[PDB]
Amino acid sequence: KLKIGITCYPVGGSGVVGTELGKQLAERGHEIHFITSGLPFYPNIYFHEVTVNQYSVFQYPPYDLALASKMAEVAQRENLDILHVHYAIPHAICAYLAKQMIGERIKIVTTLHGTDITVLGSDPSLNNLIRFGIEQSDVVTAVSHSLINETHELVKPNKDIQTVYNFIDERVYFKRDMTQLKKEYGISESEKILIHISNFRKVKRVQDVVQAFAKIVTEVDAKLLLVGDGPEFCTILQLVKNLHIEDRVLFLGKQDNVAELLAMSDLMLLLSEKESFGLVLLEAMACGVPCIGTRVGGIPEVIQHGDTGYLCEVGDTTGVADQAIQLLKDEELHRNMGERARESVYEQFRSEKIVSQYETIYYDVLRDD
Amino acid sequence: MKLKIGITCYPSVGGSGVVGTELGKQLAERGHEIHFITSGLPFVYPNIYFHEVTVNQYSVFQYPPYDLALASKMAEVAQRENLDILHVHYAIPHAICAYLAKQMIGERIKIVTTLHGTDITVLGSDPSLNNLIRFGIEQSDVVTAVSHSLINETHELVKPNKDIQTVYNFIDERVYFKRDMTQLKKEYGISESEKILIHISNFRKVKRVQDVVQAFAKIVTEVDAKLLLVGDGPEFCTILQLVKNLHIEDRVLFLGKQDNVAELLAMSDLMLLLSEKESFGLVLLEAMACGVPCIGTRVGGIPEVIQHGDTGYLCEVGDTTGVADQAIQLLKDEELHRNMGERARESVYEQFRSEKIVSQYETIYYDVLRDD
Ligand SMILES: O=c1ccn([C@@H]2O[C@H](COP(=O)(O)OP(=O)(O)O)[C@@H](O)[C@H]2O)c(=O)[nH]1
């Protein structure tokens, strides 16, 4: 009964997630309208270009005003009930305009993915905008509690936001037969490998990940995978170059296929100082990989110290070292944890369970009048 | 009863740019508090201050969120300072940003949109942005346009529910005056004694620069002229070619981008503007301000500035011959020219006088802070 309009990015952290939601809302019956800037991914979905080719005195390609317009068009001709948007900064203020232009004939559901706050909401040049985007939405949701917390103190909106966690594509992440092409990486020695797929910035504290591999490899014949190329590349490329080994810590480069070399992995590391939700942590667990993450932001909402993984202080290389060498020694516990970690995913991060929350929201917002 | 105003405009290179910046200065010079909230620093005084909208600190952003940044700063600046008026100039990124910023600050502020040509005549026809412009306009307290011509078009394309007022552009009178350029006239090898035709203006295809040189080929057969082309862009190359095929390479000077338009005008005899669509274009008013008589095509709001009778000459678009004849006619009769030029300078200090037009925006500002 519900005509729904999803809007997300063709960030890979904001889109794909809002996509799978639309992908699977069409399967429950709903009419789904993808209003978006890119062409990236069904009998119940239609796309909308959102052309940006309008530039003369084009210093600034008017993408926002063009976006807020396509929303107004698609919602006035196809007559939408809801306008769901992801990532607050670009497409929430955009959504407010369309509603305003089409005469309050629509309800809005904003969904705060982490990055739109912990990175942007730090400079006040734009802070009062996020606030107004949020406050003005009909319903607001966040993919974490640590994210709901940051918002209420960084931005301090007069609105109140509920939690809906991010599901992963449980159809792309699973235990894989990853020993055959695994050998082509020179890595079939019964090595016991460790992976790290961060973003690449200095906030992700990779200087530790390498620093810890050094301290742990002295007691385990282990190999490292540094997935993700960015600003810190040069610095880390040295940290191994001079610190003892590059024979066992090859930077795999930024790969589009992380999932495959995840199943291959035996334990991932994430020692960032600041993260709202870890999408790759699920992506790790979802295919049976135990992991060590730092007690930081929204990490203890994905990791339960215990059977799923471990939580260690932000910045403790010698301390992180332990929990790795300890686990790589034992065989049973390592396999035990690798399965319960896989399980906790499909227990509280179920693709159908999360979509279920969204749908109940969609209906509950439309309901009073 | 003085006033705190918030003026916004583009860096430079268009009508909107200089027209805001000047009205900022003029108003400051009258005791009003003039906060500039812009993309950067437009072309140091004692009375306004500037609020650059830093577009920096952004990652994994599809594009530099200027629009949203402008709105954020606009609304922030209107509070810290408590502006009584937000005066937005070229409409397209600004009138939405302003409206947006008004809504952010409890609607304490009053908003004024000032439609200059381009945002209506081309963006208005764009189905992606049309709907928005309409909303941008309607949602503003007072909307003014640079000519009556621009108002009609705004009603034909954008079709807003708002009445829009008329307030022409203006010009710092102190900047343009007959001057003599004996030194610069030599560096360009224009030492043959007289007859410099000027066309300072845009490069876009709508500017009909084609016709500007075509007519100049038909002109140059007879008076020993030199065309001074100023500004570069899309058609720039295309035009650079056309002159070649005409053998007039050694008479046409492609000055391209220029900052001191005052100097170049002060050595010019006859300005041409042959736009197929134009909405005013000061370049006419800037010329007339120093004596230089203009020949423009009869479109848009050109008839509002050039009085066909005495201050210049209007001829239908594409009539390259038509311009040329009127051009040679005028340049030949040395008595008629000096009288025409002197009358053009009159019309400017009378109809488009700076103290006047400024006083109009000022008296607009006041009449929208009463009854609220
Ligand atoms: O090379 C140039 C091009 C333009 N301008 C200035 O830009 C303004 C308007 O030019 P444009 O055609 O770009 O805008 P429009 O006249 O259409 O409003 C004039 O006042 C000029 O003083 C200039 O100084 N040098």
Swiss-Prot record, chain A:
Instruction: Name the top EC class.
Output: transferase
Listed under catalytic activity are: (S)-malate + UDP-N-acetyl-alpha-D-glucosamine = (S)-malyl N-acetyl-alpha-D-glucosaminide + UDP + H(+)
Kindly indicate whether the keyword Transferase belongs to this entry: yes
List where the protein spans the membrane.
none
User: Which Enzyme Commission numbers does its entry carry?
Assistant: 2.4.1.-
What the record says about disrupting the gene is: Mutant does not produce bacillithiol.
SUPFAM superfamilies noted in UniProt: UDP-Glycosyltransferase/glycogen phosphorylase
Q: Name one GO biological process term.
A: bacillithiol biosynthetic process
Keyword match Glycosyltransferase = yes
Q: Which NCBIfam families match?
A: thiol_BshA (TIGR03999)
- The name on file for this protein is N-acetyl-alpha-D-glucosaminyl L-malate synthase
- Organism the protein comes from: Bacillus anthracis
